[PDB]
PDB file of C-alpha atoms and ligand atoms in Angstrom:
ATOM      1  CA  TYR V  10     286.362  55.293 269.523  1.00  0.00           C
ATOM      2  CA  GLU V  11     289.765  53.763 268.940  1.00  0.00           C
ATOM      3  CA  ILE V  12     291.537  52.975 272.212  1.00  0.00           C
ATOM      4  CA  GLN V  13     295.336  52.962 272.616  1.00  0.00           C
ATOM      5  CA  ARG V  14     296.390  49.444 273.463  1.00  0.00           C
ATOM      6  CA  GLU V  15     298.711  50.415 276.310  1.00  0.00           C
ATOM      7  CA  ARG V  16     295.615  51.700 278.148  1.00  0.00           C
ATOM      8  CA  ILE V  17     294.318  48.107 278.285  1.00  0.00           C
ATOM      9  CA  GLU V  18     295.710  45.440 280.550  1.00  0.00           C
ATOM     10  CA  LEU V  19     294.420  42.099 279.253  1.00  0.00           C
ATOM     11  CA  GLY V  20     293.418  39.745 282.064  1.00  0.00           C
ATOM     12  CA  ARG V  21     292.052  36.222 282.274  1.00  0.00           C
ATOM     13  CA  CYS V  22     289.648  34.506 279.846  1.00  0.00           C
ATOM     14  CA  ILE V  23     286.088  34.869 281.291  1.00  0.00           C
ATOM     15  CA  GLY V  24     283.902  33.593 278.410  1.00  0.00           C
ATOM     16  CA  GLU V  25     283.361  33.458 274.657  1.00  0.00           C
ATOM     17  CA  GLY V  26     281.533  35.120 271.755  1.00  0.00           C
ATOM     18  CA  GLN V  27     280.957  34.102 268.148  1.00  0.00           C
ATOM     19  CA  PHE V  28     284.478  35.151 267.115  1.00  0.00           C
ATOM     20  CA  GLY V  29     286.673  34.108 270.065  1.00  0.00           C
ATOM     21  CA  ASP V  30     287.465  34.410 273.750  1.00  0.00           C
ATOM     22  CA  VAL V  31     286.200  37.158 276.007  1.00  0.00           C
ATOM     23  CA  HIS V  32     288.677  38.375 278.649  1.00  0.00           C
ATOM     24  CA  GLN V  33     288.512  40.453 281.733  1.00  0.00           C
ATOM     25  CA  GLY V  34     290.832  43.431 281.701  1.00  0.00           C
ATOM     26  CA  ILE V  35     291.545  46.877 283.019  1.00  0.00           C
ATOM     27  CA  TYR V  36     291.149  50.131 281.120  1.00  0.00           C
ATOM     28  CA  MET V  37     293.101  53.186 282.295  1.00  0.00           C
ATOM     29  CA  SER V  38     291.651  56.511 281.086  1.00  0.00           C
ATOM     30  CA  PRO V  42     291.362  55.169 286.030  1.00  0.00           C
ATOM     31  CA  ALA V  43     291.236  51.443 286.857  1.00  0.00           C
ATOM     32  CA  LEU V  44     287.970  50.606 284.977  1.00  0.00           C
ATOM     33  CA  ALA V  45     287.298  46.868 284.926  1.00  0.00           C
ATOM     34  CA  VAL V  46     286.137  45.970 281.380  1.00  0.00           C
ATOM     35  CA  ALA V  47     285.482  42.956 279.169  1.00  0.00           C
ATOM     36  CA  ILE V  48     287.404  42.521 275.974  1.00  0.00           C
ATOM     37  CA  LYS V  49     286.214  40.542 272.988  1.00  0.00           C
ATOM     38  CA  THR V  50     289.014  39.006 270.959  1.00  0.00           C
ATOM     39  CA  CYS V  51     288.851  37.514 267.501  1.00  0.00           C
ATOM     40  CA  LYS V  52     290.523  34.235 266.520  1.00  0.00           C
ATOM     41  CA  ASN V  53     290.643  34.917 262.764  1.00  0.00           C
ATOM     42  CA  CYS V  54     290.685  38.746 262.456  1.00  0.00           C
ATOM     43  CA  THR V  55     293.877  38.595 260.364  1.00  0.00           C
ATOM     44  CA  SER V  56     291.284  37.996 257.586  1.00  0.00           C
ATOM     45  CA  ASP V  57     289.481  41.244 256.715  1.00  0.00           C
ATOM     46  CA  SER V  58     286.277  39.322 255.844  1.00  0.00           C
ATOM     47  CA  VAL V  59     286.200  38.096 259.472  1.00  0.00           C
ATOM     48  CA  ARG V  60     287.427  41.457 260.771  1.00  0.00           C
ATOM     49  CA  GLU V  61     284.631  43.306 258.952  1.00  0.00           C
ATOM     50  CA  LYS V  62     281.959  41.039 260.506  1.00  0.00           C
ATOM     51  CA  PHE V  63     283.589  41.052 263.992  1.00  0.00           C
ATOM     52  CA  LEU V  64     283.533  44.842 264.171  1.00  0.00           C
ATOM     53  CA  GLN V  65     280.248  45.531 262.407  1.00  0.00           C
ATOM     54  CA  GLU V  66     277.840  45.776 265.360  1.00  0.00           C
ATOM     55  CA  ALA V  67     280.425  47.502 267.538  1.00  0.00           C
ATOM     56  CA  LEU V  68     280.264  50.274 264.934  1.00  0.00           C
ATOM     57  CA  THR V  69     276.473  50.079 264.453  1.00  0.00           C
ATOM     58  CA  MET V  70     275.826  50.082 268.204  1.00  0.00           C
ATOM     59  CA  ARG V  71     278.576  52.576 269.154  1.00  0.00           C
ATOM     60  CA  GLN V  72     276.196  55.372 270.249  1.00  0.00           C
ATOM     61  CA  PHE V  73     273.757  53.034 272.051  1.00  0.00           C
ATOM     62  CA  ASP V  74     273.329  53.841 275.702  1.00  0.00           C
ATOM     63  CA  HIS V  75     270.801  51.889 277.711  1.00  0.00           C
ATOM     64  CA  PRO V  76     271.056  50.740 281.329  1.00  0.00           C
ATOM     65  CA  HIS V  77     270.092  47.184 280.340  1.00  0.00           C
ATOM     66  CA  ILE V  78     272.336  46.764 277.337  1.00  0.00           C
ATOM     67  CA  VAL V  79     276.083  46.069 277.659  1.00  0.00           C
ATOM     68  CA  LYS V  80     277.816  49.335 276.730  1.00  0.00           C
ATOM     69  CA  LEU V  81     280.548  49.436 274.086  1.00  0.00           C
ATOM     70  CA  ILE V  82     283.552  51.449 275.273  1.00  0.00           C
ATOM     71  CA  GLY V  83     285.870  51.278 272.283  1.00  0.00           C
ATOM     72  CA  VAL V  84     287.691  49.259 269.654  1.00  0.00           C
ATOM     73  CA  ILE V  85     291.262  48.462 268.729  1.00  0.00           C
ATOM     74  CA  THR V  86     291.352  47.854 264.950  1.00  0.00           C
ATOM     75  CA  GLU V  87     295.065  46.881 264.625  1.00  0.00           C
ATOM     76  CA  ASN V  88     295.848  43.173 265.107  1.00  0.00           C
ATOM     77  CA  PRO V  89     295.003  41.707 267.557  1.00  0.00           C
ATOM     78  CA  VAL V  90     291.651  43.357 266.997  1.00  0.00           C
ATOM     79  CA  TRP V  91     289.708  43.907 270.225  1.00  0.00           C
ATOM     80  CA  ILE V  92     286.320  45.226 271.280  1.00  0.00           C
ATOM     81  CA  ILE V  93     286.214  46.884 274.715  1.00  0.00           C
ATOM     82  CA  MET V  94     283.007  46.829 276.631  1.00  0.00           C
ATOM     83  CA  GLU V  95     281.594  47.099 280.085  1.00  0.00           C
ATOM     84  CA  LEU V  96     282.171  44.195 282.455  1.00  0.00           C
ATOM     85  CA  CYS V  97     279.162  42.404 283.946  1.00  0.00           C
ATOM     86  CA  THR V  98     280.932  41.239 287.086  1.00  0.00           C
ATOM     87  CA  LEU V  99     278.232  38.729 288.151  1.00  0.00           C
ATOM     88  CA  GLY V 100     278.348  36.632 284.959  1.00  0.00           C
ATOM     89  CA  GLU V 101     275.543  35.044 282.868  1.00  0.00           C
ATOM     90  CA  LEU V 102     271.966  35.356 284.104  1.00  0.00           C
ATOM     91  CA  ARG V 103     271.247  31.608 283.612  1.00  0.00           C
ATOM     92  CA  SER V 104     273.919  30.467 286.086  1.00  0.00           C
ATOM     93  CA  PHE V 105     273.206  33.432 288.405  1.00  0.00           C
ATOM     94  CA  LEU V 106     269.588  32.226 288.699  1.00  0.00           C
ATOM     95  CA  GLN V 107     270.656  28.612 289.200  1.00  0.00           C
ATOM     96  CA  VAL V 108     273.104  29.353 292.038  1.00  0.00           C
ATOM     97  CA  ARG V 109     270.539  31.716 293.601  1.00  0.00           C
ATOM     98  CA  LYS V 110     267.499  29.430 293.106  1.00  0.00           C
ATOM     99  CA  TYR V 111     266.397  29.638 296.752  1.00  0.00           C
ATOM    100  CA  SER V 112     267.762  33.150 297.458  1.00  0.00           C
ATOM    101  CA  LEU V 113     266.245  35.438 294.770  1.00  0.00           C
ATOM    102  CA  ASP V 114     262.759  36.778 295.469  1.00  0.00           C
ATOM    103  CA  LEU V 115     260.087  36.551 292.808  1.00  0.00           C
ATOM    104  CA  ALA V 116     260.128  40.397 292.675  1.00  0.00           C
ATOM    105  CA  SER V 117     263.776  40.219 291.478  1.00  0.00           C
ATOM    106  CA  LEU V 118     262.854  37.721 288.716  1.00  0.00           C
ATOM    107  CA  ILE V 119     260.092  40.000 287.496  1.00  0.00           C
ATOM    108  CA  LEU V 120     262.421  43.021 287.693  1.00  0.00           C
ATOM    109  CA  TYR V 121     264.837  41.318 285.352  1.00  0.00           C
ATOM    110  CA  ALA V 122     262.081  40.617 282.826  1.00  0.00           C
ATOM    111  CA  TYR V 123     260.966  44.171 283.035  1.00  0.00           C
ATOM    112  CA  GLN V 124     264.489  45.528 282.601  1.00  0.00           C
ATOM    113  CA  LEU V 125     265.050  43.376 279.541  1.00  0.00           C
ATOM    114  CA  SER V 126     261.737  44.510 277.984  1.00  0.00           C
ATOM    115  CA  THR V 127     262.948  48.130 278.296  1.00  0.00           C
ATOM    116  CA  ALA V 128     266.162  47.241 276.498  1.00  0.00           C
ATOM    117  CA  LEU V 129     264.323  45.404 273.715  1.00  0.00           C
ATOM    118  CA  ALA V 130     261.913  48.355 273.217  1.00  0.00           C
ATOM    119  CA  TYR V 131     264.917  50.693 272.982  1.00  0.00           C
ATOM    120  CA  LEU V 132     266.671  48.566 270.371  1.00  0.00           C
ATOM    121  CA  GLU V 133     263.475  48.453 268.325  1.00  0.00           C
ATOM    122  CA  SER V 134     263.315  52.242 268.661  1.00  0.00           C
ATOM    123  CA  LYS V 135     266.806  52.430 267.076  1.00  0.00           C
ATOM    124  CA  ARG V 136     265.571  50.102 264.298  1.00  0.00           C
ATOM    125  CA  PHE V 137     268.255  47.650 265.340  1.00  0.00           C
ATOM    126  CA  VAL V 138     267.726  44.136 264.021  1.00  0.00           C
ATOM    127  CA  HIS V 139     269.840  41.512 265.759  1.00  0.00           C
ATOM    128  CA  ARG V 140     270.430  38.724 263.317  1.00  0.00           C
ATOM    129  CA  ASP V 141     272.846  36.383 265.134  1.00  0.00           C
ATOM    130  CA  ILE V 142     270.128  34.904 267.324  1.00  0.00           C
ATOM    131  CA  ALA V 143     272.314  32.004 268.565  1.00  0.00           C
ATOM    132  CA  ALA V 144     274.601  34.610 270.249  1.00  0.00           C
ATOM    133  CA  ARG V 145     271.826  36.221 272.334  1.00  0.00           C
ATOM    134  CA  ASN V 146     272.539  36.238 276.047  1.00  0.00           C
ATOM    135  CA  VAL V 147     271.759  38.087 279.249  1.00  0.00           C
ATOM    136  CA  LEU V 148     274.450  39.146 281.677  1.00  0.00           C
ATOM    137  CA  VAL V 149     274.304  40.317 285.300  1.00  0.00           C
ATOM    138  CA  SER V 150     275.997  43.596 286.208  1.00  0.00           C
ATOM    139  CA  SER V 151     274.532  43.729 289.751  1.00  0.00           C
ATOM    140  CA  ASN V 152     271.890  42.073 291.970  1.00  0.00           C
ATOM    141  CA  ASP V 153     269.329  44.534 290.585  1.00  0.00           C
ATOM    142  CA  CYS V 154     270.594  44.951 287.015  1.00  0.00           C
ATOM    143  CA  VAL V 155     270.746  42.645 283.996  1.00  0.00           C
ATOM    144  CA  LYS V 156     271.950  43.541 280.529  1.00  0.00           C
ATOM    145  CA  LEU V 157     271.551  42.285 276.964  1.00  0.00           C
ATOM    146  CA  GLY V 158     274.739  40.884 275.421  1.00  0.00           C
ATOM    147  CA  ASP V 159     275.912  38.664 272.573  1.00  0.00           C
ATOM    148  CA  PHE V 160     278.589  36.668 274.366  1.00  0.00           C
ATOM    149  CA  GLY V 161     278.860  34.194 277.202  1.00  0.00           C
ATOM    150  CA  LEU V 162     280.528  34.394 280.600  1.00  0.00           C
ATOM    151  CA  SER V 163     281.904  31.275 282.416  1.00  0.00           C
ATOM    152  CA  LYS V 178     273.642  26.283 265.695  1.00  0.00           C
ATOM    153  CA  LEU V 179     270.156  27.865 265.620  1.00  0.00           C
ATOM    154  CA  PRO V 180     268.318  28.077 268.937  1.00  0.00           C
ATOM    155  CA  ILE V 181     265.258  26.119 267.655  1.00  0.00           C
ATOM    156  CA  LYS V 182     263.740  25.683 271.149  1.00  0.00           C
ATOM    157  CA  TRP V 183     263.609  29.492 271.552  1.00  0.00           C
ATOM    158  CA  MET V 184     262.442  30.391 268.013  1.00  0.00           C
ATOM    159  CA  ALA V 185     259.022  31.483 266.663  1.00  0.00           C
ATOM    160  CA  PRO V 186     257.169  29.017 264.388  1.00  0.00           C
ATOM    161  CA  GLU V 187     257.634  31.303 261.395  1.00  0.00           C
ATOM    162  CA  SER V 188     261.389  31.405 262.038  1.00  0.00           C
ATOM    163  CA  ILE V 189     261.668  27.591 262.266  1.00  0.00           C
ATOM    164  CA  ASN V 190     259.379  26.979 259.275  1.00  0.00           C
ATOM    165  CA  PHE V 191     260.269  29.787 256.913  1.00  0.00           C
ATOM    166  CA  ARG V 192     263.238  31.656 258.401  1.00  0.00           C
ATOM    167  CA  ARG V 193     260.952  34.739 258.755  1.00  0.00           C
ATOM    168  CA  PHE V 194     262.486  37.084 261.399  1.00  0.00           C
ATOM    169  CA  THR V 195     260.649  40.185 262.589  1.00  0.00           C
ATOM    170  CA  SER V 196     260.108  42.052 265.841  1.00  0.00           C
ATOM    171  CA  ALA V 197     257.251  39.603 266.391  1.00  0.00           C
ATOM    172  CA  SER V 198     259.590  36.706 266.238  1.00  0.00           C
ATOM    173  CA  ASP V 199     261.781  38.556 268.824  1.00  0.00           C
ATOM    174  CA  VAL V 200     258.689  38.843 271.033  1.00  0.00           C
ATOM    175  CA  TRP V 201     258.179  35.034 270.886  1.00  0.00           C
ATOM    176  CA  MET V 202     261.781  34.529 271.936  1.00  0.00           C
ATOM    177  CA  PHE V 203     261.474  37.025 274.747  1.00  0.00           C
ATOM    178  CA  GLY V 204     258.435  35.103 276.037  1.00  0.00           C
ATOM    179  CA  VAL V 205     260.708  32.107 276.221  1.00  0.00           C
ATOM    180  CA  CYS V 206     263.422  34.193 278.007  1.00  0.00           C
ATOM    181  CA  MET V 207     260.773  35.242 280.585  1.00  0.00           C
ATOM    182  CA  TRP V 208     259.822  31.608 281.143  1.00  0.00           C
ATOM    183  CA  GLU V 209     263.498  30.674 281.656  1.00  0.00           C
ATOM    184  CA  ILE V 210     263.916  33.470 284.218  1.00  0.00           C
ATOM    185  CA  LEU V 211     260.808  32.354 286.123  1.00  0.00           C
ATOM    186  CA  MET V 212     262.172  28.770 285.984  1.00  0.00           C
ATOM    187  CA  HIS V 213     265.478  29.859 287.632  1.00  0.00           C
ATOM    188  CA  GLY V 214     267.447  29.286 284.423  1.00  0.00           C
ATOM    189  CA  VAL V 215     266.000  25.958 283.209  1.00  0.00           C
ATOM    190  CA  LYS V 216     266.180  25.739 279.373  1.00  0.00           C
ATOM    191  CA  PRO V 217     263.012  25.225 277.328  1.00  0.00           C
ATOM    192  CA  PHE V 218     262.139  21.783 275.962  1.00  0.00           C
ATOM    193  CA  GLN V 219     264.837  19.990 277.921  1.00  0.00           C
ATOM    194  CA  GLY V 220     265.587  16.542 276.475  1.00  0.00           C
ATOM    195  CA  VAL V 221     263.375  17.198 273.407  1.00  0.00           C
ATOM    196  CA  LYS V 222     264.892  16.847 269.890  1.00  0.00           C
ATOM    197  CA  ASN V 223     264.966  20.200 268.025  1.00  0.00           C
ATOM    198  CA  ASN V 224     263.071  18.414 265.236  1.00  0.00           C
ATOM    199  CA  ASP V 225     260.084  17.727 267.484  1.00  0.00           C
ATOM    200  CA  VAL V 226     259.641  21.266 268.780  1.00  0.00           C
ATOM    201  CA  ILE V 227     257.656  22.608 265.838  1.00  0.00           C
ATOM    202  CA  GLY V 228     255.324  19.585 266.066  1.00  0.00           C
ATOM    203  CA  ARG V 229     254.476  20.410 269.703  1.00  0.00           C
ATOM    204  CA  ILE V 230     253.877  24.075 268.984  1.00  0.00           C
ATOM    205  CA  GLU V 231     251.658  23.175 266.010  1.00  0.00           C
ATOM    206  CA  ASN V 232     249.693  20.841 268.342  1.00  0.00           C
ATOM    207  CA  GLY V 233     248.937  23.879 270.555  1.00  0.00           C
ATOM    208  CA  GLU V 234     251.419  22.859 273.259  1.00  0.00           C
ATOM    209  CA  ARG V 235     253.364  25.475 275.170  1.00  0.00           C
ATOM    210  CA  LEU V 236     255.872  25.662 277.966  1.00  0.00           C
ATOM    211  CA  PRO V 237     253.968  25.205 281.246  1.00  0.00           C
ATOM    212  CA  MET V 238     253.339  27.770 283.976  1.00  0.00           C
ATOM    213  CA  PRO V 239     256.476  27.942 286.132  1.00  0.00           C
ATOM    214  CA  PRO V 240     256.084  27.112 289.829  1.00  0.00           C
ATOM    215  CA  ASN V 241     255.298  30.292 291.775  1.00  0.00           C
ATOM    216  CA  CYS V 242     254.879  32.353 288.577  1.00  0.00           C
ATOM    217  CA  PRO V 243     251.989  34.811 288.895  1.00  0.00           C
ATOM    218  CA  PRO V 244     249.178  33.735 286.519  1.00  0.00           C
ATOM    219  CA  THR V 245     249.127  37.317 285.070  1.00  0.00           C
ATOM    220  CA  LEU V 246     252.772  36.919 284.034  1.00  0.00           C
ATOM    221  CA  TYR V 247     252.202  33.452 282.602  1.00  0.00           C
ATOM    222  CA  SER V 248     249.266  34.929 280.663  1.00  0.00           C
ATOM    223  CA  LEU V 249     251.669  37.518 279.182  1.00  0.00           C
ATOM    224  CA  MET V 250     254.135  34.737 278.191  1.00  0.00           C
ATOM    225  CA  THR V 251     251.313  32.863 276.425  1.00  0.00           C
ATOM    226  CA  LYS V 252     250.433  35.988 274.443  1.00  0.00           C
ATOM    227  CA  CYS V 253     254.092  36.164 273.263  1.00  0.00           C
ATOM    228  CA  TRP V 254     253.545  32.615 271.999  1.00  0.00           C
ATOM    229  CA  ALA V 255     250.590  33.380 269.746  1.00  0.00           C
ATOM    230  CA  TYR V 256     251.072  31.225 266.629  1.00  0.00           C
ATOM    231  CA  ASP V 257     249.999  34.177 264.465  1.00  0.00           C
ATOM    232  CA  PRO V 258     252.804  36.741 264.848  1.00  0.00           C
ATOM    233  CA  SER V 259     250.246  39.574 264.355  1.00  0.00           C
ATOM    234  CA  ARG V 260     248.504  38.584 267.602  1.00  0.00           C
ATOM    235  CA  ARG V 261     251.652  38.898 269.746  1.00  0.00           C
ATOM    236  CA  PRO V 262     252.111  41.957 271.980  1.00  0.00           C
ATOM    237  CA  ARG V 263     254.612  44.662 271.018  1.00  0.00           C
ATOM    238  CA  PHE V 264     257.640  45.385 273.247  1.00  0.00           C
ATOM    239  CA  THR V 265     255.966  48.657 274.331  1.00  0.00           C
ATOM    240  CA  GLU V 266     252.966  46.705 275.689  1.00  0.00           C
ATOM    241  CA  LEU V 267     255.228  44.107 277.318  1.00  0.00           C
ATOM    242  CA  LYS V 268     257.108  46.853 279.179  1.00  0.00           C
ATOM    243  CA  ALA V 269     253.862  48.487 280.408  1.00  0.00           C
ATOM    244  CA  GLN V 270     252.388  45.150 281.506  1.00  0.00           C
ATOM    245  CA  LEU V 271     255.585  43.989 283.223  1.00  0.00           C
ATOM    246  CA  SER V 272     255.744  47.210 285.233  1.00  0.00           C
ATOM    247  CA  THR V 273     252.190  46.530 286.514  1.00  0.00           C
ATOM    248  CA  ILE V 274     253.060  42.937 287.343  1.00  0.00           C
ATOM    249  CA  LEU V 275     256.249  43.921 289.256  1.00  0.00           C
ATOM    250  CA  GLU V 276     254.406  46.417 291.402  1.00  0.00           C
ATOM    251  CA  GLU V 277     251.763  43.801 292.242  1.00  0.00           C
ATOM    252  CA  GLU V 278     254.370  41.267 293.386  1.00  0.00           C
ATOM    253  CA  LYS V 279     256.231  43.837 295.511  1.00  0.00           C
ATOM    254  CA  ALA V 280     252.851  44.504 297.211  1.00  0.00           C
ATOM    255  CA  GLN V 281     252.446  40.858 298.380  1.00  0.00           C
TER     256      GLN V 281
HETATM  257  C1  1BR F 301     266.672  38.524 275.973  1.00  0.00           C
HETATM  258  N1  1BR F 301     266.886  38.372 274.543  1.00  0.00           N
HETATM  259  C2  1BR F 301     268.030  38.929 273.911  1.00  0.00           C
HETATM  260  C3  1BR F 301     269.253  38.852 274.597  1.00  0.00           C
HETATM  261  C4  1BR F 301     270.400  39.451 274.036  1.00  0.00           C
HETATM  262  C5  1BR F 301     270.311  40.110 272.791  1.00  0.00           C
HETATM  263  N2  1BR F 301     271.478  40.660 272.210  1.00  0.00           N
HETATM  264  C6  1BR F 301     271.494  41.867 271.329  1.00  0.00           C
HETATM  265  C7  1BR F 301     272.868  42.501 271.543  1.00  0.00           C
HETATM  266  C8  1BR F 301     273.857  42.366 270.577  1.00  0.00           C
HETATM  267  C9  1BR F 301     275.118  42.967 270.814  1.00  0.00           C
HETATM  268  C10 1BR F 301     275.373  43.636 272.014  1.00  0.00           C
HETATM  269  C11 1BR F 301     276.732  44.261 272.311  1.00  0.00           C
HETATM  270  C12 1BR F 301     276.598  45.771 272.562  1.00  0.00           C
HETATM  271  C13 1BR F 301     277.351  43.588 273.556  1.00  0.00           C
HETATM  272  C14 1BR F 301     277.711  44.071 271.149  1.00  0.00           C
HETATM  273  C15 1BR F 301     274.350  43.764 272.964  1.00  0.00           C
HETATM  274  C16 1BR F 301     273.112  43.180 272.737  1.00  0.00           C
HETATM  275  C17 1BR F 301     269.102  40.158 272.109  1.00  0.00           C
HETATM  276  C18 1BR F 301     267.934  39.602 272.669  1.00  0.00           C
HETATM  277  C19 1BR F 301     266.631  39.676 271.957  1.00  0.00           C
HETATM  278  C20 1BR F 301     265.573  38.848 272.319  1.00  0.00           C
HETATM  279  C21 1BR F 301     264.467  39.137 271.527  1.00  0.00           C
HETATM  280  N3  1BR F 301     264.795  40.124 270.731  1.00  0.00           N
HETATM  281  N4  1BR F 301     266.132  40.470 270.969  1.00  0.00           N
HETATM  282  C22 1BR F 301     266.801  41.536 270.233  1.00  0.00           C
HETATM  283  S1  1BR F 301     265.749  37.666 273.583  1.00  0.00           S
HETATM  284  O1  1BR F 301     266.396  36.525 272.999  1.00  0.00           O
HETATM  285  O2  1BR F 301     264.557  37.457 274.322  1.00  0.00           O
END
């Protein structure tokens, strides 16, 4: 899915990914607003091969809650063309809308994300660059998984087996999603604020967990705590999370 460069009008810098700046632009095939990943060092084929890898691996992915890849330009400057999430990063969206988003919206986002994570697992996709993981906002009622920002290891988000042994499985992704859920219900507050990364594993191994967010339904906090089972085998699967989140969303909308 090689795009002709003259079909792309490169606009302003809107964020960053692991390899360089992300720009807004326009793609005429007309007037589709898109985001364009650029790559600082893609004159080197070693860098170029890594920059493009997931764009190729994820090319045929199509999920409402995952940023869609549109195309690539593999001549220097190498670019990846993808859908534009016009409302930016979910963390800042939640912060600026702290007193204006209903709890039902927060639960909707968690649910949407669970559907995306179940789908990726169904494609046997393993996402290894965990530091790059991010959630973007495409509309008031739609969030999407991405690997770049708009506007080091994430120890405070990681499963105990990942911190201790660098074991990474779907179960470790479930732990991290539990943390994501907590952040959403906290209007974008990061976990373990002010805590040294070094001291996180000690707290977990003392049985401590992130506390129930204000206004979070106890059923949803219960689900988060299951994601944070120390034993990865006792964590729920993404299928179960999706089912359970759907039930929780309905209940909140009925309040
Ligand atoms: C919510 N979590 C999460 C957020 C983002 C991602 N990114 C995977 C991805 C990589 C590349 C793209 C392209 C198409 C833009 C190139 C899209 C999505 C992953 C996750 C995640 C979590 C737990 N498991 N997984 C896979 S999370 O951190 O809770």
